[PDB]
Write a protein that binds this ligand. Structure first.
Ligand SMILES: [Ca+2]
Ligand SMILES: [Ca+2]
Ligand SMILES: [Cl-]
Ligand SMILES: [Cl-]
Ligand SMILES: [Cl-]
Ligand SMILES: [Cl-]
Ligand SMILES: [Cl-]
Ligand SMILES: [Cl-]
Ligand SMILES: [Cl-]
Ligand SMILES: [Cl-]
Ligand SMILES: [Mg+2]
Ligand SMILES: [Mg+2]
Ligand SMILES: [Mg+2]
Ligand SMILES: [Mg+2]
Ligand SMILES: [Mg+2]
Ligand SMILES: [Mg+2]
Ligand SMILES: [Mg+2]
Ligand SMILES: [Mg+2]
Lengths: 236, 6, 236, 6
């Protein structure tokens, strides 16, 4: 792409500089260039790729929700007609967000997932695939919506099945996967009971394994466990 | 106030 | 431009939606499209144009300062050589920032300033011209640097001369112009005494005119007066 | 900590 001429190491070094400068669109472009070099990603590199895109897409999602709320209000009885501009601009933001999701899903399909053999890489990428189909599902209203939801479910389920077999119940990737799959159940699949059961069981199985951990691993795991508790508190 | 994801 | 086909009113309405969504690059593009319709800007519209670009350029300036600090450290004795990437990426961010400054300065030259006859429009645009030459001066290191500084000075000085003749000493535009011209003296022109004298005199002349104001005008003016005090406190 | 502009 436009990053075709830059060394892989220089793309990684610039992604880290962009992160320090809070320039997340640049960070994501540098990391997309690094992926497109064709080599597998190390754990540090996979987390640079995730950090970059989650911040880009998170700006688009928060903007989309502001716009959608405005558009819904314009559709209430007694609202003055203001023309097509709110729908057009929500659509503009929606299309760009879909495009970011398609770009991430494209990197995973070409060819991050197929070369990822170890559990920590394979589960991380499948969680990513679930997360970006979930962001597509958040905006979907069409004939497509069930299949987008199903794609998110299927990716999360394959990541859950590997993580349960190959990772300890305290592993931060296994914990974050379960936190996000639980959010998928609650907010996307209309299954709040499955969301609460998943968050509860995940929290309790990690609590029972904390004893095996070093002080630093303990802090990594308990951080994610508190997110699961925050959602159980919100939902119960 | 918003549910957590990571 | 790409906004050539959109109604002026629809560009204004979308700039306001983008502001609500914190999508400041979109807001600036919509407002550039509105300017390029050729009609003068109302006071509300001029402030949408300023808000949009100040947020875009403010993200670039804060990133440039992070990068420049990193690059300066890489240049200290005992620093390990890491290659050209920090300079390249600071330059990339610098070039984009210059481009935003050139775009704003271009709108002012073509043709916002030449059609602006009332003091509140003419002083606002000349302050804008001073502010964007000042942002160019913050990054300038070349043969150009003195003339960029001089361009900022000249624009601020013409805005100061009109504002003193045609606006009350409490006017928020006159106060914000003086605050920024004082920052120009302190940080760009190596004239901290002129910066302190300007902030002091501006604050004291506004204090003496507060009695003429309504409660809402009083709040507008005192807000800016507190910024002048904050800088006097920092500098003395 | 940073000087104010507007
Ligand atoms: Ca129940
Ligand atoms: Ca002195
Ligand atoms: Cl960004
Ligand atoms: Cl639009
Ligand atoms: Cl899948
Ligand atoms: Cl509760
Ligand atoms: Cl933006
Ligand atoms: Cl670069
Ligand atoms: Cl001038
Ligand atoms: Cl002091
Ligand atoms: Mg190479
Ligand atoms: Mg009505
Ligand atoms: Mg309309
Ligand atoms: Mg952690
Ligand atoms: Mg028209
Ligand atoms: Mg050394
Ligand atoms: Mg290097
Ligand atoms: Mg004010």
């Amino acid at each position: 792409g436009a990053m075709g001429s830059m060394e892989r190491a220089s793309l990684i070094q610039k992604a880290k500089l962009a992160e320090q400068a809070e320039r997340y669109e640049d960070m994501a472009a540098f990391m997309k260039g690094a992926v497109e070099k064709g080599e597998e990603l190390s754990v540090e590199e996979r987390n640079l790729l995730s950090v970059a895109y989650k911040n880009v897409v998170g700006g688009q999602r928060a903007a989309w929700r502001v716009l959608s709320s405005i558009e819904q209000k314009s559709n209430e009885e007694g609202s003055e007609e203001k023309g097509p501009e709110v729908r057009e601009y929500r659509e503009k933001v929606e299309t760009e967000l879909q495009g970011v999701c398609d770009t991430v899903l494209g990197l995973l399909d070409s060819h991050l997932i197929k070369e990822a053999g170890d559990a920590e890489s394979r589960v991380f990428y499948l969680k990513m695939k679930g997360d970006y189909y979930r962001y597509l599902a958040e905006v979907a209203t069409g004939d497509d919506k069930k299949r987008i939801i199903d794609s998110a479910r299927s990716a999360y389920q394959e990541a859950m099945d590997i993580s349960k077999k190959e990772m300890p119940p305290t592993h931060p990737i296994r914990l974050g996967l379960a936190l996000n799959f639980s959010v998928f159940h609650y907010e996307i699949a209309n299954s709040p009971e499955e969301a609460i059961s998943l968050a509860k069981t995940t929290f309790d199985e990690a609590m029972a394994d904390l004893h095996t951990l070093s002080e630093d691993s303990y802090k990594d795991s308990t951080l994610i466990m508190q997110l699961l508790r925050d959602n159980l508190t919100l939902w119960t | 106030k918003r549910r957590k994801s990571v």
